[PDB]
Design a protein that fits this description.
Number of strands of chain A: 8
Number of domains of chain A: 1
Organism of A, E, F: Bacteriophage sp.
Radius of gyration of chain A: 14 Å
Largest sheet of chain A: 4 strands, antiparallel
Entry title: Carin1 bacteriophage mature capsid
Radius of gyration of chain B: 26 Å
Largest interface: B-C, 39 and 27 residues
Number of domains of chain B: 1
Strand content of chain B: 15-25%
Order of helices and strands of chain B: HHEEEEHHEEEEEEEEHEHE
Helix content of chain B: 10-25%
Oligomer: part of a larger assembly
Strand content of chain A: 5-15%
Keywords: Bacteriophages, virus structure, Cryo-EM, marine podovirus, Icosahedral symmetry, virus
Distance between the termini of chain B: 50 Å
Chains A, E, F: Capsid Decoration Protein
PDB class: virus
Order of helices and strands of chain A: EEEEEEEE
Chain lengths: 129, 342, 49, 49, 129, 129, 330
């Protein structure tokens, strides 16, 4: 993979607590980029989770820097910690449709965590097996 | 955050066909037409502090001489005004690997260069029509800032520029304007400072070595795009604009275009003698309405024009009164109120 | 995978560079939209005899 | 796919039935697939209702 | 949309009342699809709907021909009644990851509508606009 | 109109109080810049003032970086809050005589101003209406 | 308060010498030999975004015709896998006056380029073996993480990665592993993406001018080094891993490597590939443990190469001997 810096939501972000993503990719124009030729994305969990219980991994999109009202484009559900190992993908392969203005990832966690990290972001080409 | 500054990877993925090659044919869908920058006359300032205009502000009115009287000799006063040029440029910054993995460099440069050319043209036309340097200190004075005030009465001779603007009763954020500029050596023209060159200058800098603040030397490629010009409206007798043209009207039969255009034509105090090429620029809403009131069909309680078969649709709006009507997209149908000088 | 088209949905916003001042580069923000085909077909057997 | 409304005079065939029946047939096939792909809706305008 | 029989979940299937896809895909062996080359699918509503509260078109897979081991590869979610309109792509643009021997489409509707139809399957080139 | 970054005493600088300039200019050897061919300067006001009372446009110069000793070269008096609008110059169009080593602008105000901005600095070509 | 960031006068004084100018003989004291980089083939990424691969997955069932009886048509279902790639670069920096100050410029950059070449070789071999996309998403997945599991009892036919990993048994912080791979176009090879050339790409960026926090522009000569490389496992039945080899029990006589090797050869696929080199990839400890004396070497110009059953044994210095325990997929 040749995943790069700019269009990347989080780089090895712990989000051990109930945090959110840091690099909110913002686009001035509502391109809704998923249309036509696809764009691969990952929300692959990069390092294991110790004492969490659920890792709802929404892909909230909104129309303001601060996500006053956000819209969900991909939610992984209440994934139990038994699967939050390295390489555990948490959404669809390619870019979804409906990216209105802004894009930030939520990390609602049931309870806190003592370990856990992710590398959500856009990738030039997926890695499989 | 961000993601909007440099040419990211998602955009490069979007700029290629399914065969894996960069797209040669890109639908613009945002280009605009603005022949103001095409028909405008421009020449080098070729002087000191700036282009110089000499305006007379006094006449030595003669005296009714009684016999055996000493007439006091009089002098002719003059006033001087100078106008300056402005410069802007924009830059393209792309990773070299972003180019190499796209299998095609020249195509990506062509796409980005065309986009930058269109962007600069649109920006320049916008500033020419609205160069409000009153609050900028750059973006040289255009045309709207000079005439952003109208005088309701007393508009007999061009004492100020408030007599060169005609109220049309508009209100709200749906106002517009029509400019009738005259380009000529003395009427008005464009301007660029000496040493530079006319038109947009573009330079291909090749591969760069972008150095980061925190020790980072990733290699980028850049292109230079430079274009500078300035304006000089020597006479405010050569430019007349209509303010408060409410687009809530002008789509229905409430404001007659040709009435205001004739009123302004006669306000153009220097068409009586040929100074230079003339023009009447619109925003394609005015021209639409003008063909709506010059080839009328079922219009509202107006339009003494009488039609014939084969001439029921409309032909064109090319010339107003011999003045060519060049359609400039820079003009906006939102301009805020131009107030009445008390 | 069907014919693709590349709309442009934004253009840079250049800046008046006062001398010795830096200009922050911008990019051409494009967008894509693709289309597909669809087939019609009819047949006729007419009992060659 | 070939361009435009196609036509294929297949010629004589056999048309085997489901009960052992067999008799010649001749089949002519007409095919056409296309998509209109309005690449720039700036070039198209509609008046409806 | 170049649909095709022998690779179609359901052709013009009516949705009214809880039911599954009429046709269940069978890929010979339990090998994978979503990986590698993208495979577009459209579980899309075709004909409008009625008083039914929601709809839950899920892409269930199972190793057995009859689906006794449910496995959600991708879910439409509880789409509200208002958005059950023609042309609504109810699930992911591309085929999710982890295809088993067989795949089905499960329609779980909150209540029963008097109208509603879906044509779901894999297309040669998903047609945008 | 052409301007610079260094030969610029302010750029939309806030005057919400009795503030002073920001970019104090140096000229190497002390020298006198008012001699010889004139060098223009623009003290145009931007962002129309709201609640001030008087704007003192002193043009203090010094021989030390810190303006412990200052030498007034020009002034504009107590120009009222009325007027002070956009495009309002407030000093001599060119550089006065007596530029010791450095230059700056003082902005004494008889009260508080809730708005206001200035663009003091040398300009390549003055813009006369 | 240090002096290691950029090249200094001390280094050129220590390398460029010999009563004269730069030497063309700089001995690579840290030159861990990894013949994996030489045996492995490379192939341009024709596809464009992630090296693609089509593998047959189902087989048609032929039939015997019985006195004009029909034969039903047969399908042949196919799986497809994508192999992403990854790039490494490096940058040299010498003050232009420093380069000119030495009598030669080409050689003083040539040895500095050999240094970078050795470093890239070492890092790429390390990531070729233990390169994980699971933790380093900027790292192309190596040979190991595709096999960090094993089936207890091997399936009748290889149908999974875990069915090609032999659990040698072990634990602790001293286990190692052995790789038997065949390098071929249909088995496994390197990947330089489209546009990017194959292998290392030395790039000499002439002379440039630098900056600091306070002006201070000075002239530097910058050499740009790049290497793109992706790894693809085609027909993964050609790769077998023997995991959890306790080196402590290996130095002593507790486990024999020959049993593990024969088990792996049993679990390999018979060589039928044309033009495909194959080899063993085991650290120095394994070949040291081969001190057990009829398995013998074979005639290739009389070279230091063991030939375990017609397969060269390339001892690779990059195979770290303190791996993590490989779990079992019960």
């Amino acid at each position: 993979m040749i995943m790069d810096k700019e269009n990347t939501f989080s780089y090895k972000q712990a989000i051990t607590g109930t945090a959110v993503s840091t690099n909110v990719i913002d686009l001035g124009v509502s391109r809704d980029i998923g249309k036509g030729v696809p764009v691969p994305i990952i929300i692959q969990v990069v390092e294991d989770f110790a004492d969490a219980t659920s890792l709802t991994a929404t892909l909230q999109t909104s129309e303001t820097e601060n996500f006053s009202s956000a819209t969900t484009l991909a939610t992984s559900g209440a994934v139990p910690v038994a699967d939050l190992t390295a390489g555990k993908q948490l959404a669809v392969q390619y870019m979804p449709l409906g990216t209105q203005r802004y894009l930030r990832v939520n990390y609602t966690v049931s309870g806190t965590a003592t370990a856990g990290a992710v590398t959500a972001g856009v990738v030039m080409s997926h890695q499989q097996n | 955050t961000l993601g909007n500054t440099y040419l990211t990877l998602a955009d490069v993925q979007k700029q290629k066909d399914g065969k894996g090659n960069v797209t040669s044919e890109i639908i613009e869908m945002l280009a605009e037409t603005n022949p103001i920058l095409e028909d405008m006359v421009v020449m080098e300032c070729n002087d000191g502090t700036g282009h110089l205009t000499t305006i007379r502000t006094g006449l030595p009115q003669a005296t009714w001489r009684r016999l055996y009287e000493g007439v006091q000799p009089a002098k002719s006063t003059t006033r001087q005004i100078k106008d300056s040029t402005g410069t802007l440029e924009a830059w393209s910054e792309v990773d070299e690997k972003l180019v190499k993995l796209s299998k095609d460099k020249q195509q990506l440069m062509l796409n980005e260069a065309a986009a930058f050319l269109e962007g600069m043209n649109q920006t320049m036309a916008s500033t020419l029509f609205y160069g409000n340097t009153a609050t900028d200190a750059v973006k040289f004075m255009g045309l709207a800032p000079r005439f952003n005030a109208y005088r309701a009465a007393r508009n007999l001779k061009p004492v100020d520029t408030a007599d060169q603007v005609i109220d049309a009763g508009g209100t709200g954020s749906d106002l517009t304007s029509i400019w009738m500029v005259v380009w000529g050596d003395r009427t008005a023209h464009g301007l660029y400072p000496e040493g530079t060159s006319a038109g947009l200058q573009r330079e291909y800098l090749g591969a760069e070595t972008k150095e980061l603040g925190d020790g980072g030397v990733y290699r980028v490629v850049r292109e230079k795009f430079e274009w500078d010009l300035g304006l000089t409206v020597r006479d405010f007798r050569y430019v007349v604009r209509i303010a408060n043209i409410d687009v809530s009207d002008l789509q229905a039969g409430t404001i007659d275009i040709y009435a205001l255009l004739r009123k302004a034509y006669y306000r153009l105090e220097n068409r009586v003698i040929t100074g230079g090429r003339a023009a009447l620029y619109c925003n394609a809403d005015v021209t639409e309405a003008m063909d709506a009131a010059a080839t009328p069909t079922s219009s509202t309680t107006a339009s003494y024009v009488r039609l014939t078969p084969m001439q029921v649709d409309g032909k064109e709006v090319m010339m107003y009164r011999g003045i060519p009507v060049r359609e400039c997209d820079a003009i906006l149908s939102t301009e805020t109120a131009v107030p009445s000088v008390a």
